[PDB]
Amino acid sequence: SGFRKMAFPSGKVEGCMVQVTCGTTTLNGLWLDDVVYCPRHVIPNYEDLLIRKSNHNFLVQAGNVQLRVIGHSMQNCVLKLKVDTANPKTPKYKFVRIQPGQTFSVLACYNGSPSGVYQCAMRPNFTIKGSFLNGSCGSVGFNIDYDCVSFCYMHHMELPTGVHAGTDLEGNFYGPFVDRQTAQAAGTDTTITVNVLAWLYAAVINGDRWFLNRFTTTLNDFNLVAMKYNYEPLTQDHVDILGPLSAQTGIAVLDMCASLKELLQNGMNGRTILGSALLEDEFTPFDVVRQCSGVTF
Amino acid sequence: SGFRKMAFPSGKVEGCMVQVTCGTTTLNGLWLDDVVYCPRHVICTSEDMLNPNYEDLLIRKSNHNFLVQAGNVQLRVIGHSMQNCVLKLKVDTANPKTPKYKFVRIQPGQTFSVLACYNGSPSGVYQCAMRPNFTIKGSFLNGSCGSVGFNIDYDCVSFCYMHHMELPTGVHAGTDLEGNFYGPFVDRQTAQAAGTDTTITVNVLAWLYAAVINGDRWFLNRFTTTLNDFNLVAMKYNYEPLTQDHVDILGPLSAQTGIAVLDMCASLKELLQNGMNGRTILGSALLEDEFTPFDVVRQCSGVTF
Ligand SMILES: O=C(Nc1cncc2ccccc12)[C@@H]1CN(S(=O)(=O)CC2CCOCC2)Cc2ccc(Cl)cc21
Ligand SMILES: O=C(Nc1cncc2ccccc12)[C@@H]1CN(S(=O)(=O)CC2CCOCC2)Cc2ccc(Cl)cc21
Numbered sequence A: 001s002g003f004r005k006m007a008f009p010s011g012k013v014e015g016c017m018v019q020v021t022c023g024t025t026t027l028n029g030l031w032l033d034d035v036v037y038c039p040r041h042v043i044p045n046y047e048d049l050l051i052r053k054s055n056h057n058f059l060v061q062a063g064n065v066q067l068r069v070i071g072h073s074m075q076n077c078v079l080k081l082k083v084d085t086a087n088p089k090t091p092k093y094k095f096v097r098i099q100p101g102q103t104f105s106v107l108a109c110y111n112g113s114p115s116g117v118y119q120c121a122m123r124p125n126f127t128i129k130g131s132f133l134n135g136s137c138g139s140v141g142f143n144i145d146y147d148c149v150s151f152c153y154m155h156h157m158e159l160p161t162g163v164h165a166g167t168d169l170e171g172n173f174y175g176p177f178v179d180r181q182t183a184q185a186a187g188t189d190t191t192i193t194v195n196v197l198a199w200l201y202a203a204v205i206n207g208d209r210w211f212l213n214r215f216t217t218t219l220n221d222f223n224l225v226a227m228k229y230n231y232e233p234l235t236q237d238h239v240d241i242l243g244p245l246s247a248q249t250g251i252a253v254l255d256m257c258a259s260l261k262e263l264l265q266n267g268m269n270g271r272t273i274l275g276s277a278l279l280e281d282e283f284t285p286f287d288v289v290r291q292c293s294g295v296t297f
Numbered sequence B: 001s002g003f004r005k006m007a008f009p010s011g012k013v014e015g016c017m018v019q020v021t022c023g024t025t026t027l028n029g030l031w032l033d034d035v036v037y038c039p040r041h042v043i044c045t046s047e048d049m050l051n052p053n054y055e056d057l058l059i060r061k062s063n064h065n066f067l068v069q070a071g072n073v074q075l076r077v078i079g080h081s082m083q084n085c086v087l088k089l090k091v092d093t094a095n096p097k098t099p100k101y102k103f104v105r106i107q108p109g110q111t112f113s114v115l116a117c118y119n120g121s122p123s124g125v126y127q128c129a130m131r132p133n134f135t136i137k138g139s140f141l142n143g144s145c146g147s148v149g150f151n152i153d154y155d156c157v158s159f160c161y162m163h164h165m166e167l168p169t170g171v172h173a174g175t176d177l178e179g180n181f182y183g184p185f186v187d188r189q190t191a192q193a194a195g196t197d198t199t200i201t202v203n204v205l206a207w208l209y210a211a212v213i214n215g216d217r218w219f220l221n222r223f224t225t226t227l228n229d230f231n232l233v234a235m236k237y238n239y240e241p242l243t244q245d246h247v248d249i250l251g252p253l254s255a256q257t258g259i260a261v262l263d264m265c266a267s268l269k270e271l272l273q274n275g276m277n278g279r280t281i282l283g284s285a286l287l288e289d290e291f292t293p294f295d296v297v298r299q300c301s302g303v304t305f
């Protein structure tokens, strides 16, 4: 029993975190094999700024050891620093680009030292509601599948509303953001419908059934209602993805959609679901299945 | 900016997790130097759990009855002893991944990270608090026994909890790393229930100061209160009494934000009376009590917005 916001064990990622200094700027880098990956803003015409730098201008520190930079190149908004030593702690890994609604673990670092781990989701407006201070740039997002670390995010900046923006590990931003000081704002955000439904199934599994009702709905009628509460549209793919949870609890996806519709129109009425007075949207269907089954890494 | 429930990086603890098998029971152990620490109920059957005599069960065991597995390697048990409700298995190999560590016993209201494991393999990490009724609201399934709670302030791992059991309400009970239970619980299948739980007042106050640091002040008011009047109101909402120690502990946050502890107490009294009225504080519609004053100082900036 119990339902927590759970992150992946961070050990395989901790052994990759390094500190990168260029002039007055200090941030975090990801050391995999003989390459250190970090935001290109550590150095705007970034090719003109980069051409003026030499390998020795980049100071890379792995723990108490100084790593020697032997080359450098830029890929989109990510700088790749070729180092003379391969990371002996390099895990099995892939660089993956995630979609809005998907969740991941963030290892927040300052000065190449990991300070915390938390779980979060890529919002529909491509921002993340993270917890970051100055010096956190270069901190990474990841998932783990068996023994393979899938790196999906690298932190670049904070938006005026306090939310965060970054890139995949190939340097492509999530969202219409650019790496520079200019007027940028997060777009209007929406609730991840498929994730709220998964969390309602997790509440049923944990013995919370007060919100269930005898009713059902069509996908069209549910989507007409959901659009009015700034909820993301629910697709047939989402319905198919929720199939296992529907079979386990005995509540059809459109039966659970009718429960969600009543919660949106009437509220919780002084009640909570899994210790929350709000509808939670940062657990995917796979997160619910994994936490209510005990998958290990 | 931002405020998340943040756990410590778990790597130093992952390198200590092992699987312990005794007969038909399999659970987790903590391998530090040449000792594996695990719940003593690993020597029990489900039948034994009603009224087990651990001393009588242990005397019948030999070292080779305990199977310890660290990854794909079988460790050899060369000794065993019981200390309160934990079993200490002496092994022939010291853990090369042993971090700098201490065993610390925590008080209710304190927070810690939990590395949930099954079969000696870490599956997840989450943050939680020792409730005033000495239980923890964790996320654990069968096979999670032996999973540990810890803090990593600086580079030293402070082990404070080892998971032993789930109570009927879905809440969890366990021991410090010396085998002493938190709360009036026994590692017995006897009728035991968690006492009525209360809200950790000092932690809700710390979280309200974190909201002020992050730029939110809608809940503040022009009033103050005496400590006694605040406690008379707080007890009516099942909130823990606020002591002078708690007031002293909140001093730094009071100095940083410019809001006196008893003025913040007046805001809390008003939130308890009125609710949030469709508003949230740090993305929450409930008053959060699982961030200590120390957690707020650690996570939040030193400059108020
Ligand atoms: O965002 C950036 N850093 C950060 C990143 N994360 C969390 C932070 C928290 C607090 C302060 C910085 C943070 C940097 C630095 N800044 S900055 O103007 O100094 C910081 C602003 C950010 C918005 O809130 C007000 C303060 C300009 C900048 C421009 C472009 C790029 Cl790509 C990065 C960056
Ligand atoms: O608690 C224990 N294990 C667990 C531990 N943690 C989380 C669990 C979740 C699910 C199942 C077991 C869990 C064990 C075994 N059990 S048990 O009967 O399997 C537990 C009940 C709790 C209510 O839900 C049904 C199962 C009795 C027992 C008695 C004393 C002691 Cl010290 C340990 C233990």
Ligand SMILES: [Cl-]
Pocket (backbone or CB within 6 Å): B105, B106, B107, B110
């Ligand atoms: Cl303590």
